[PDB]
């Protein structure tokens, strides 16, 4: 009686283990659906909704703004995030000039 039941109880533990793998595999496609975002620093403020941000490659463009960002932190001297398609500001990231960690961290032991 308990021989067939114990075999299914062990499979039930494997079912819950596959449930975490289902979402983990589906999140892989969800992570690949995202696109790239350009990172640049604000140089000069042209207008309220018009900013001049220097791309990391060295060209500059006039980019717009969205409703998900605050224009108070979009001023000059602050690194922001641009768009690779319409060339507009998308999100806001903390300021890091050239994030080389091996130079910043000393590997203390």
């Amino acid at each position: 009686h308990r021989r067939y039941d114990d075999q299914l109880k062990q499979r039930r533990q494997n079912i819950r283990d596959l449930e975490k793998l289902y979402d983990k595999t589906e999140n892989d496609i969800k992570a690949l659906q995202s696109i790239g975002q350009l990172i640049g620093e604000v140089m000069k403020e042209l207008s309220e909704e018009k900013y001049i941000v220097k791309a990391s490659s060295g060209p500059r463009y006039i980019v717009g703004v969205r409703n998900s960002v605050d224009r108070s932190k979009l001023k000059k001297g602050v690194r922001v995030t641009l768009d690779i398609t319409t060339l507009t500001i998308m999100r806001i990231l903390p300021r890091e000039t050239d994030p080389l960690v091996y130079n910043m961290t000393s590997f203390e032991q």
């Binding site: 067939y4 039941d5 299914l8 109880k9 499979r11 039930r12 079912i15």
Partner: peptide, 9 residues
């Protein structure tokens, strides 16, 4: 009981 988890599997 053995016809559920086996069918759910």
């Amino acid at each position: 009981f053995r016809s559920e988890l086996q069918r759910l599997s």
